[PDB]
Amino acid sequence: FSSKTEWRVRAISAANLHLRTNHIYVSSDDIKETGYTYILPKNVLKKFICISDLRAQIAGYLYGVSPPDNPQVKEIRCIVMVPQWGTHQTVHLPGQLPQHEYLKEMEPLGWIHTQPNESPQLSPQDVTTHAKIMADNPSWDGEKTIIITCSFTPGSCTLTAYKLTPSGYEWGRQNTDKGNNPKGYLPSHYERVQMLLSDRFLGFFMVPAQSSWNYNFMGVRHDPNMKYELQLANPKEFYHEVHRPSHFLNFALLQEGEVYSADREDLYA
């Protein structure tokens, strides 16, 4: 990245993300009609869209449950943001899975991540990351977890849900190439699962305790094996002050200053 004025322009662009949050499109096509259905609360959806960036992808774990006497539908009741740094085509989450008391009552349902532009297929990077997470963590059942992709289309956010088939799981768990077009990736590895919005219930967020979630500016400080404790709160903004300490802290002090400054009495105080 340029990192000199590109971040300035991107911050200015991200300041208008809340306009996208009223033009949302759901891709209801190629859905197999046989799997689960998923319900995403609009409050957490809008907060996630607002706190994101137009270029560097962000991602967060989903937790949810099933409504009483309706186990084939799953309500997403929580989103967890973890110390991460991402590029325009991938997100480098830490190996540790979220662990907290409140989450113990909900069953993990996958993860949701942003996309700079819409694409008609699940990317090799996303499939391999999903497979790696599932293999590393036994709690991630391959039939209930999914991937939710939010693509920033012109003046809108298009949401699409994808599920990983066993063949894709094996290919991802074995693959090691992080390039855009690895070998052995086929459209049979994933399938579309039905996802819809809901105004009837509200979900919540969970952010790290000691630090914030966005490390993009503090890239060096992040490690995949980093450990973190959670906390019940709401996320900050991508370009929040805490997330870019360099811009605010790299200044200098005052030495012999205010010596030739103007004289103006603050009469009111």
Binding site: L202, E258, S261, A262, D263, E265, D266, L267
Partner: protein, 1538 residues
């Protein structure tokens, strides 16, 4: 009639520089000559006026003795002071002293303060400091800061505290309360008055000294205009005289100035022209004429050098410049010119001593630039250099070693070192406010020339003024008594009108014009209409200028309405304050700026848009970005963190980058740029505070958090991502930056040890200091407990625990926090409130209870945050979780008031019964009509829920009649929670039943001996819950308690209040008796409309066809409720601000009808009555509240003892409080009922014992000071409902109006709970032990299973199935309910056994013990008897036994109010027995003191005797318990003593 004016056209564009006299005549010897490219004009040193044949400098040994100690070292007085000392010491008359600058006006001001001080001498002592305050208004901040020291030194002998007004609003109010001589600037005093912080001491402010009042010409002139107009109008309305002393410069229009000051032209008006200047000054002027500024500046340099040469070897020179850098620049410049011309030695000739002193001080100097000049005769002096160095310069000049001081105006203002010669260089200053190069002001010019001529050494001053030729005339007129003073109020008229409207002084256009008349502008327009855009035609048309004043008011109101600062109607001309206007007035923001904010601010702004919005403020409208600074602005644009959307060529972008640079602490180079930085920062403080207030009021959580952070960030000059240890200014920047580099969350440091932190930061030397400072950092701990109240409202009890070491030097008197309760998304505030943590109450828990609404989509959590109001990163958050919250079921609908026909009196059966309803009403109100067929015609237990004043007593009477019809020898027991209400009802039914129906009614008292006789004798037994519990506790023995027939319970809705569990237990016991005694004790319950009435009906035995729960909108008389929010966190200030609103509401709603005003305490009543009368007198409608004539008042006014009450009643206002005797209470009540007096101001505690109903009910400040916790606890909703129900006049009034003026915090709570019916819960779990022990001794409880069965009867048990979370329950399941019941009963039984009041065998059987039997016998708290049995030994005595009694837990409720501690301390020193470690906050020590006082029959205050009677009520039973317990123990001498 009204006409819109062109206000901006009318204003004077030059403001302070505006010229009013077209001519400028100079004295005789005032030649002029054209030298070269400039004109030299001369004016000679005015010859002093010869001393009058009978005027002299009288010595200080002649003025009054109390005024001598203020003059220390002063042998004679100046001529002016000797002239007017008689006026300034012997009379309280308003003065206008016109004297030259530097003539000793401060000494005259000291004379006036000495008069005000000698009024209070404290003969045996020295001074009564706390009875008066004096305001001294000086125009410059440096001048204020130096007057503070001067007057403190002068008046130190009196112990008078002289202080400057500074700091936040809380700090300023504390300073006012703590000090006497308040020195302040006009702006500072105006802003404190607008915010109302001094409202508590304006009465004690007995004098204002407006120093240098020629400021009226300046753009600051409107400030003094508003100050004086407000002071004069307050004097006239409230009639509390305040003395005005105008110290003015010798200039024209002083007659108009005296008129504006209400100063007599004969006595209070004097004139001391420039001739009287103590050191006459030859004033010369060099007007440069060339039209190119480069040559003008070069000629300026040459001329300053020439004038320095003029007095090079003769006298000292004070050269005056504009900028700090220009100071050294021109000083070095003149040094170099004299060096080039070889005139450097003239200044420092071979004066070995002086030259060596200068050289040594230079070589010691730490300032390099000043070190470069001290070796020679030149020096610099500006505020930007070290304090040590500037005092060094000052003392050197005072020693006369330096020959030329180059300085700016701050020296001339704040330090009085007068030099022989003064040279003003150029007089051109860069004003950022106007955004250009403008001219010096009159005030600054006059002060800087005042130093010309030292009175000690100098015999003639020499003032050179080097200016431009065109401007020469302005300064000549200023300095030759030819600058007439002209009001600039047209510039800021809308602002002052808004300020007055917000303060409530002016309500409609009429009052606005009345105020405008007083203003200085009015006098100027009246005298000279042309100068102010008015024609002599207009003047003749409106000789008082009323039409022009009305037009100005109309224009100002139109501007305010267009910008939405006031709701102004052109029809009636009335004004309504908007919250936007409140903020604008409090923070001095301009109407254009506040409109811009109202248009731009949105909930979704970011930290990028916030800076843009702040920059777009109109205050910077004049600031324009110039190209010369554009490259540096670009550099700042690159370095500033927050991106700038604008392009750098916009002034908005300029302000953005300048503010970011200031916060970032960068250093700039361009002088104009630093001037703009200073200006924008000083404006930004207030502007950002105002924006924060706006967003907070509109409830935007994200944006209010952002703006509060930004305000604190500007104040602390540090980004909030830095290390919070910078805020401690004593710490080394190197160590704070080391901590910043080692970036970890700050909270990490708290858990560590001082060595631990020292090694983490690698600074073991600093480790201890860092540990001390981190622990000094403020920190709070929050613990929340929440109970669902209804399906739409919770109750949150939040405990705040400090976690830091208080330290006055860093924290001070108080610490301010904001408590914000916001929803799950943290985007709307549900409840914001202030919180003051005073030093006195540190290291202890603080409870903060509030009601937060909960909406249909039950959110997973809410968030409660406490954020400091001053410190950065001092935040704590707590998520309140609704995971296990069980919301009670939504209450059923009320029994609709079916439209029955009016029930006729013939509907009743018995003629003797009708006899007592015939002449009162021919028909019963619809409530009685409906309820009659169930009460009289049906026998089941009945519940009647109707709004207070609905005649529920008449339905109860129907029930009594039905019982009497069943059998004349029945027995009705009428239980009433309050004894006063019991007395009222006893009177009513004694006149109703016994006198007419010949049926006995007996009112039980607290004497069980005669209570049984009365119960067995009478037929209507009036009782209170406790006086009847003392009977029913032995119901098995008392057959009279068994063979009852009717149980009427009055307002059972008072079950969920203090002492409510007693009523609950007696009612449940009666139900159980009825169930066992073979004949139902039919029960009739009366209540306010209860939401949860089904449960109480089920508990009491009612049927769903006998439950009658109506709605608060079912009262026979409709009610108009109005709740007024007063967002004043301070309680006394809110109380005093509500006074005028009370009168306004009385005028608006009930102009000619009865009004009752309920005030919190016993003292507030008199003050409220006096205030309402004072405001009604200020208005022309005096005695308007006396519907009768004074002829009819003497027979009643002669029976009263309170002289002030007699005065208020004569004027037409009565008042009532417990301190008054019953005779007086009844007399005022009779007067009010008859209608002789309109307004009655009654105590809060009296809302229950009142035999009167009014048309209008006003409620004040629904809180009262509980001193046990030192907190202002809210009114109980039961009492508030009683107050509002008192607004019940059935026949005389078509409607009843009630206005409650409450804090905005409780506004929503009242709005919620006063319109809908009232849910009620039980509070028995906490007061369980007493009644449980009573039943145990009665043997109703014999094993824990029977205990659970007994609990299954209480109303508590019913609610533990519908609202479990209220009782710490976690489920309505049978398991959960049984487990909670078992836990509660086991806990209570264990505690009782520990007290030894019971004995538990097999952990399953309970048996009584002696302590339990005694406690149940004489109705003592089990805890109290435990304390007695433990503390009472075989060798106690009366001296200690009084203490043991005072420790009884029956006195924990004795009221501890404010001002109650000092007189209690006085009492402690006179009683026969002394108290060990007596903490007068303690009810037990208080009760011991009052017991001893009663025994010694000493004089007591009325309020103290009120509590003494309450103490003595239970003292007899307590001492009886003492006797019986000592009997059980077997201790003869202690029993004898008891």
């Amino acid at each position: 009639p009204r006409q819109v004016l062109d206000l901006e056209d009318l204003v004077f564009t030059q403001g302070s520089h505006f010229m009013a006299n077209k001519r400028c005549q100079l004295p005789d010897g005032s030649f002029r000559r054209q030298r070269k490219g400039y004109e030299e004009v001369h004016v000679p040193a005015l010859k002093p006026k010869p001393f009058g044949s009978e005027e002299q400098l009288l010595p200080v040994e002649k003025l009054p003795k109390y005024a001598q100690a203020g003059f220390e070292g002063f042998k004679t007085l100046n001529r002016i002071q000797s002239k007017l000392y008689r006026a300034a010491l012997e009379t309280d008359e308003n003065l206008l002293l016109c004297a030259p600058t530097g003539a000793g006006k401060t000494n005259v001001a000291l004379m006036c303060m000495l008069r005000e001080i000698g009024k209070h001498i404290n003969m045996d002592g020295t001074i009564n400091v706390d009875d008066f305050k004096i305001i001294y208004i000086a125009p410059m901040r440096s001048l204020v800061q130096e007057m503070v020291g001067s007057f403190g030194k002068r008046l130190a002998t009196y112990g008078i505290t002289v202080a400057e007004l500074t700091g936040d609003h809380q700090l300023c109010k504390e300073e006012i309360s703590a000090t006497q001589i308040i020195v302040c600037t006009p702006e500072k005093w105006d802003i404190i008055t607008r915010k109302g912080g001094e409202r508590t001491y304006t009465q004690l402010v007995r004098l204002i000294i407006l120093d240098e009042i020629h400021l009226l010409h300046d753009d600051r002139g409107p400030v003094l205009e508003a100050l004086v107009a407000r002071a004069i109008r307050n004097i006239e309305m409230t009639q509390e005289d305040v003395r005005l002393i105008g110290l003015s410069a010798t200039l024209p229009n002083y007659e108009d100035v005296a008129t504006f000051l209400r100063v007599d032209p004969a006595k209070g008006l004097f004139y001391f022209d420039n001739s009287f200047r103590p050191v006459p000054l030859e004033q010369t002027y060099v007007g440069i004429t060339e039209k190119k500024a480069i040559k003008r500046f070069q000629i300026m340099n040459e001329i300053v050098y020439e004038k320095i040469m003029e007095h090079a070897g003769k006298n000292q020179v004070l050269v005056f410049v504009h900028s700090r850098k220009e100071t050294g620049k021109t000083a070095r410049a003149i040094r170099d010119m004299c060096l080039e011309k070889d005139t450097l030695g003239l200044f420092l000739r071979e004066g070995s001593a002086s030259t060596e002193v200068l050289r040594t001080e230079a070589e010691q100097c730490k300032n390099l630039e000043l070190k470069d000049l001290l070796p020679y005769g030149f020096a610099i002096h500006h505020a930007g250099m070290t304090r040590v160095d500037r005092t060094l310069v000052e003392d050197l000049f005072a020693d006369k070693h330096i020959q030329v001081l180059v300085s700016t105006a701050t020296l001339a203002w704040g330090v009085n070192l007068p030099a022989h010669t003064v040279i003003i260089k150029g007089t051109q200053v860069y004003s950022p406010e106007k955004g250009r190069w403008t001219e010096l002001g009159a005030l600054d010019i006059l002060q800087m020339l005042g130093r010309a001529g030292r009175p000690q050494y100098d015999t003639k001053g020499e003032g050179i003024l080097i200016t431009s030729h065109g401007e020469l005339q302005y300064y000549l007129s200023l300095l030759n008594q030819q600058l007439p003073i002209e009001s600039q109020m047209v510039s800021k008229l809308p602002d002052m009108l808004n300020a007055e409207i917000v303060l409530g002084n002016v309500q409609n256009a009429k009052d606005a014009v009345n105020w405008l008349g007083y203003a200085y502008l009015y006098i100027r327009m009246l005298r000279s209409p042309t100068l102010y855009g008015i024609s002599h035609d207009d003047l003749k048309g409106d000789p008082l200028l009323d039409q022009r004043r009305l037009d100005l008011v109309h224009t100002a109101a139109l501007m305010l309405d267009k910008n939405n600062l006031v709701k102004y109607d052109k029809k009636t001309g009335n004004f309504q304050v908007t919250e936007l206007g409140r903020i604008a007035s409090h923070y001095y923001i301009t109407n254009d700026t506040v409109q811009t904010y109202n248009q731009l601010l949105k909930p979704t702004l970011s930290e990028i848009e916030l800076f843009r919005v702040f920059s777009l403020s109109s205050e910077f409208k004049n600031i324009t970005v110039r190209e010369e600074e554009k490259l540096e602005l670009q550099k700042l644009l690159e370095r500033v963190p927050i991106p700038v959307k604008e392009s750098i060529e916009e002034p908005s972008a300029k302000i953005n980058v300048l503010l970011q640079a200031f916060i970032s602490q960068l250093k700039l180079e361009g002088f104009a740029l630093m001037a703009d930085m200073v200006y924008v920062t000083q404006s930004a403080g207030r502007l950002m505070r105002a924006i924060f207030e706006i967003v907070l009021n509109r409830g935007w959580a994200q944006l209010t958090d952002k703006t509060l952070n930004l305000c604190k960030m500007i104040d602390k000059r540090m980004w909030q991502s830095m290390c919070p240890l910078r805020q401690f200014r004593k710490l080394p920047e190197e160590v704070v930056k080391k901590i910043e580099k080692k970036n970890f969350p700050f909270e990490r440091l708290y858990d560590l040890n001082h060595n631990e932190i020292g090694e983490l930061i690698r600074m073991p030397k600093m480790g201890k200091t860092i540990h001390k400072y981190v622990h000094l950092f403020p920190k709070l701990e929050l613990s929340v407990h929440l109970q669902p109240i209804t399906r739409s409202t919770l109750k949150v009890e939040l405990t705040i625990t400090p976690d830091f070491q208080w330290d006055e030097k860093v924290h001070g008197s108080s610490e301010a926090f904001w408590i914000l309760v916001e929803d799950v998304d943290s985007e709307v505030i549900l409840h914001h409130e202030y919180f003051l943590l005073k030093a006195k109450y540190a290291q202890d828990e603080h409870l903060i209870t509030f009601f937060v609404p909960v909406f249909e989509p039950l959110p997973p959590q809410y968030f409660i945050r406490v954020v400091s109001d001053r410190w950065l990163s001092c935040e704590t958050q707590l998520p309140v979780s609704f995971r296990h919250l069980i919301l009670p079921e939504k209450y059923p609908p009320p029994t609709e008031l079916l439209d029955l026909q009016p029930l006729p009196v013939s509907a009743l059966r018995n003629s003797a019964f009708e006899s007592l309803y015939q002449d009162k009403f021919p028909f019963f109100n619809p409530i009685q009509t409906q309820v009659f067929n169930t009460v009289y015609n049906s026998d089941d237990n009945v519940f009647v829920g109707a709004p207070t004043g609905s005649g529920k007593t008449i339905c109860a009477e129907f029930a009594i009649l039905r019982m009497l019809l069943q059998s004349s020898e029945g027995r009705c027991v009428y239980i009433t929670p309050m004894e006063a209400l019991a007395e009222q009802v006893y009177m009513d039914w004694y006149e109703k039943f016994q006198d007419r129906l010949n049926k006995k009614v007996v009112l039980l008292t607290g004497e069980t001996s005669t209570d049984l006789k009365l119960l067995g004798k009478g037929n209507i037994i009036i009782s209170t819950p406790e006086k009847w519990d003392i009977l029913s506790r032995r119901w098995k023995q008392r057959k009279n308690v068994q063979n009852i027939n009717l149980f009427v319970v009055d307002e059972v809705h008072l079950i969920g209040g203090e002492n409510g569990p007693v009523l609950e237990v007696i009612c449940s016991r009666m139900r159980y008796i009825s169930s066992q005694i073979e004949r139902p004790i039919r029960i009739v319950a009366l209540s306010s409309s209860l939401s949860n009435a089904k449960d109480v009906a089920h508990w009491l035995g009612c049927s769903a066809t006998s439950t009658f729960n109506f709605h608060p909108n079912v009262r026979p008389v409709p009610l108009e409720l109005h709740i007024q929010g007063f967002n004043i966190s301070h309680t006394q200030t809110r109380l005093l601000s509500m006074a005028k609103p009370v009168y306004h509401a009385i005028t608006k709603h009930s102009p000619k009808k009865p009004v009752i005003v309920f005030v919190p305490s016993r003292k507030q009543t008199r003050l409220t009555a006096i205030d309402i009368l004072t405001t009604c007198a200020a208005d022309i409608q005096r005695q308007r509240f006396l519907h009768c004539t004074e002829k009819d008042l003497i027979p009643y006014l002669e029976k009263l003892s309170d002289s002030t009450l007699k005065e208020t009643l004569l004027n037409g206002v009565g008042y009532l409080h417990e301190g008054l005797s019953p005779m007086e209470r009844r007399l005022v009540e009779q007067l009010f009922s008859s209608g002789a007096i309109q307004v009655v101001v009654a105590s809060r505690s009296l809302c229950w014992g009142m035999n009167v109903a009014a048309h209008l009910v006003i409620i004040m400040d629904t809180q009262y000071y509980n001193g046990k916790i030192h907190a202002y606890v809210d009114y109980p909703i039961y009492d508030v409902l009683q107050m509002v129900g008192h607004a019940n006049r059935p026949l005389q009034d078509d409607e009843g109006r009630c206005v409650i003026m409450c804090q905005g915090s409780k506004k929503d709570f009242f709005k919620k709970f006063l319109y809908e019916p009232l849910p009620v819960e039980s509070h028995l779990d906490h007061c369980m032990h007493d009644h449980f022990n009573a039943e145990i001794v009665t043997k109703t409880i014999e094993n824990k299973q029977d205990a659970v069965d007994y609990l299954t009867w209480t109303f508590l048990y019913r609610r533990m199935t519908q609202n479990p979370n209220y009782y710490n329950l976690q489920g309505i399941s049978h398991r959960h309910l049984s487990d909670h019941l078992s836990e509660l009963v086991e806990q209570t039984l264990s505690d009782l056994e520990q007290s030894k009041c019971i004995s538990i065998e097999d952990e399953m059987d309970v048996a009584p013990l002696n302590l339990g039997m005694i406690a149940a016998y004489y109705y003592i708290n089990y805890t109290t008897i435990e304390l007695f049995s433990m503390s009472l030994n075989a060798k106690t005595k009366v001296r200690g036994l009084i203490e043991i009694i005072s420790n009884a837990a029956e006195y924990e409720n004795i009221p501890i109010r404010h001002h109650e501690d000092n007189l209690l301390r006085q009492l402690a020193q006179k009683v026969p027995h002394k108290l060990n470690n007596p903490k007068f906050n303690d009810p037990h020590v208080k009760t011991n003191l009052l017991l001893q006082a009663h025994l010694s029959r000493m004089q007591l205050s009325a309020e103290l005797q009120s509590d003494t009677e309450e103490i003595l009520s239970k003292a007899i039973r307590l001492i009886q318990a003492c006797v019986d317990v000592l009997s059980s123990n077997g201790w003869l001498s202690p029993a004898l003593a008891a």
